[PDB]
Design an enzyme around this catalytic site. Structure first.
Site, PDB file in Angstrom:
ATOM      1  N   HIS C  46       0.775  -1.250   0.000  1.00 31.03           N
ATOM      2  CA  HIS C  46       0.000   0.000   0.000  1.00 31.03           C
ATOM      3  C   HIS C  46       0.794   1.281   0.000  1.00 31.03           C
ATOM      4  O   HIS C  46       1.895   1.408   0.561  1.00 31.03           O
ATOM      5  CB  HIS C  46      -0.927   0.181   1.271  1.00 31.03           C
ATOM      6  N   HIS C  48       0.835   4.559   1.860  1.00 32.58           N
ATOM      7  CA  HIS C  48       0.478   5.256   3.103  1.00 32.58           C
ATOM      8  C   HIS C  48       0.625   6.795   2.956  1.00 32.58           C
ATOM      9  O   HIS C  48       1.240   7.372   2.028  1.00 32.58           O
ATOM     10  CB  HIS C  48       1.268   4.678   4.266  1.00 32.58           C
ATOM     11  N   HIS C  63      -3.567   4.713   5.383  1.00 34.43           N
ATOM     12  CA  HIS C  63      -3.478   4.619   3.926  1.00 34.43           C
ATOM     13  C   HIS C  63      -3.819   5.938   3.267  1.00 34.43           C
ATOM     14  O   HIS C  63      -4.613   6.695   3.768  1.00 34.43           O
ATOM     15  CB  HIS C  63      -4.382   3.524   3.388  1.00 34.43           C
ATOM     16  N   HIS C  71     -11.289   0.848   3.026  1.00 36.09           N
ATOM     17  CA  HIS C  71     -10.264   0.003   2.479  1.00 36.09           C
ATOM     18  C   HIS C  71     -10.861  -1.043   1.549  1.00 36.09           C
ATOM     19  O   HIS C  71     -11.870  -1.650   1.860  1.00 36.09           O
ATOM     20  CB  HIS C  71      -9.520  -0.665   3.637  1.00 36.09           C
ATOM     21  N   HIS C  80      -9.211   3.019  -0.974  1.00 38.28           N
ATOM     22  CA  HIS C  80      -8.285   4.129  -0.800  1.00 38.28           C
ATOM     23  C   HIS C  80      -7.475   4.223  -2.067  1.00 38.28           C
ATOM     24  O   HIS C  80      -7.278   3.192  -2.780  1.00 38.28           O
ATOM     25  CB  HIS C  80      -7.298   3.721   0.287  1.00 38.28           C
ATOM     26  N   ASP C  83      -4.607   1.673  -2.076  1.00 35.26           N
ATOM     27  CA  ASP C  83      -4.874   0.260  -1.887  1.00 35.26           C
ATOM     28  C   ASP C  83      -4.331  -0.487  -3.095  1.00 35.26           C
ATOM     29  O   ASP C  83      -4.875  -0.419  -4.166  1.00 35.26           O
ATOM     30  CB  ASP C  83      -6.371  -0.051  -1.541  1.00 35.26           C
ATOM     31  N   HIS C 120       3.522  -5.131   3.732  1.00 33.08           N
ATOM     32  CA  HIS C 120       3.197  -5.685   5.066  1.00 33.08           C
ATOM     33  C   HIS C 120       3.685  -7.084   5.428  1.00 33.08           C
ATOM     34  O   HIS C 120       4.225  -7.884   4.660  1.00 33.08           O
ATOM     35  CB  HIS C 120       1.718  -5.623   5.392  1.00 33.08           C
ATOM     36  N   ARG C 143       4.477  -3.615   9.538  1.00 33.77           N
ATOM     37  CA  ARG C 143       5.191  -3.027   8.437  1.00 33.77           C
ATOM     38  C   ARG C 143       6.723  -3.195   8.520  1.00 33.77           C
ATOM     39  O   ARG C 143       7.493  -2.391   9.053  1.00 33.77           O
ATOM     40  CB  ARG C 143       4.860  -1.544   8.321  1.00 33.77           C
TER      41      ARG C 143
HETATM   42 CU   LIG Z   1      -0.860  -0.511   4.528  1.00 38.71          CU
HETATM   43 ZN   LIG Z   2      -6.430   0.881   2.501  1.00 38.40          ZN
END
Ligand SMILES: [Cu+2]
Ligand SMILES: [Zn+2]
Ligand SMILES: [Cu+2]
Ligand SMILES: [Cu+2]
Ligand SMILES: [Cu+2]
Ligand SMILES: [Zn+2]
Ligand SMILES: [Zn+2]
Ligand SMILES: [Zn+2]
EC number: 1.15.1.1
Lengths: 153, 153, 153, 153
Positions: C46, C48, C63, C71, C80, C83, C120, C143
């Site tokens: 993702h 962020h 995010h 999400h 998002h 995403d 992640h 993370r």
């Molecule tokens: Cu994330």
């Molecule tokens: Zn998200």
């Protein structure tokens, strides 16, 4: 991201306010149509802090002022976020218009969703009155109508 | 966060719904007092998606349901977030109570702020019924009063 | 209009992600090679919000969601901007591929330039969980590696 | 409008540099704290072209110079917009301070967001050497640390 406030009250004032904001950094578009006002007047239009109507428009608190500033004009650098200035009414007491704003938001920490829009009984002096209240409320006077800002379709 | 909803309509039912949620993780406590209802009865009480009051209670839409589930009882696993089941009315037609709910939030992506509270004319069957309609609305019937959920204190 | 993110952390995961966009309206091409992941898995990938590394990957924030959505999966309407779903890891823990995206931009108001890419430790549920956390992050977990998106070529 | 670069590399030199710009016309404020330098010295401090850390600091490219000038001091007319001159270190090799600059921006087409901040290993001759390199990099030598300028809040 699209919100609406239906204005209601007990003084014959009534109307609808539309909010549009596409993205966090973009400006919100405010569109209103309110009737039952004084004809040919200038009336205060603001965002009050609480979407609380327990006792009517008086329950809404002071102006939305996340940044702790002083009351001003929409165009001033020093204003409350809820400062939308005055709306001008027509020969029939109808105020209709639209505008863009950079302080008022639907998205993020300063969102106005859940807060109230107020149409005052008097005119907003944009803080350039010679009274101390001018710097608080702009002396716009009482609250004929208000409405909670809600999320819509 | 403290939010409130003032419940109005044109059928003489009216009242106040208070929300309280200290933190995200934490449960929301809901408290209410509603008047004008039939006596000794049970009436459906929900959170509908829109805080849109341009068309009375109608414009509030369906039950807030971010998790895309079917209608159920507040104590069911399968249920809408908005499903608060039935309020019990007393000999005077008053509904007074309180409860804690873990789906209903004031903070977060599933926040109910800017949405609407609905007090129905009928009893919520809790999705345990006859129809398909049960699975959507619990067949609660029409909506005599509603209110946009606003921030207060 | 060419950008890059060098993903580093304290977990043995590292890699490089490339982004290329010729004009604001055109889709952004995402290319990547990331190593040190679990083998033959699906890990969340993702964008962020912040390009802030003062506090590891923690400081990248949530995010990127300028449009105020929940999400989801890269291919859903509701998601998002950041995403990007899951990447698939091979027998060696390597995740290599590319894809085109129309919400991610390097040009304009919603540009990701200066923001962070995070890989992640877990799998993204795609917002198809029943919790609010699913709606916030897809429950992708910690993370291990992240990096600021910078301009290059 | 607010940004940061976290300085790292493989020589003990580390630090944080913060930037703040309210609007495109305003000047940018730069504040920094850098450690691990030689003490009581002067070291070159510049914004390099690429926020590319692929191979480390050598990947940042040359000085940011959208206006095609020649290397100089922050106070000359002819300078790269990325020329921040020298930072003075104290007895423990710490460089700390703040400045305001008019070339460097966070907003608009010459924004530095997504580019790199570099701290050199030697002193910048500010373009006043007789050599050729002087006009390019001010002979500030290698790059002990650098970081990408990312968005923050
Ligand atoms: Cu994330
Ligand atoms: Zn998200
Ligand atoms: Cu006011
Ligand atoms: Cu209902
Ligand atoms: Cu340099
Ligand atoms: Zn004000
Ligand atoms: Zn329901
Ligand atoms: Zn230079």
């Amino acid at each position: 991201v699209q919100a609406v406030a239906v204005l209601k009250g007990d003084a014959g004032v009534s109307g609808v306010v539309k909010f549009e904001q596409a993205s966090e950094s973009e400006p919100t578009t405010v569109s209103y149509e309110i009737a039952g006002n004084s004809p040919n007047a200038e009336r205060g239009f603001h965002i009050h802090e609480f979407g609380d109507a327990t006792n009517g428009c008086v329950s809404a608190g002071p102006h939305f002022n996340p940044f702790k500033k002083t009351h001003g004009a929409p165009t001033d650098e020093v204003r409350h976020v809820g400062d939308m200035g005055n709306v001008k009414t027509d020969e029939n007491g109808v105020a209709k218009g639209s505008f863009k704003d950079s302080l008022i938001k639907l998205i993020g920490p300063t969102s106005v969703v859940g807060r109230s829009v107020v149409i005052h009984a008097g005119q907003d002096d944009l803080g350039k009155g010679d009274t101390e209240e001018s710097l608080k409320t702009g002396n716009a006077g009482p609250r004929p109508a208000c409405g909670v800002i809600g999320l819509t379709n």
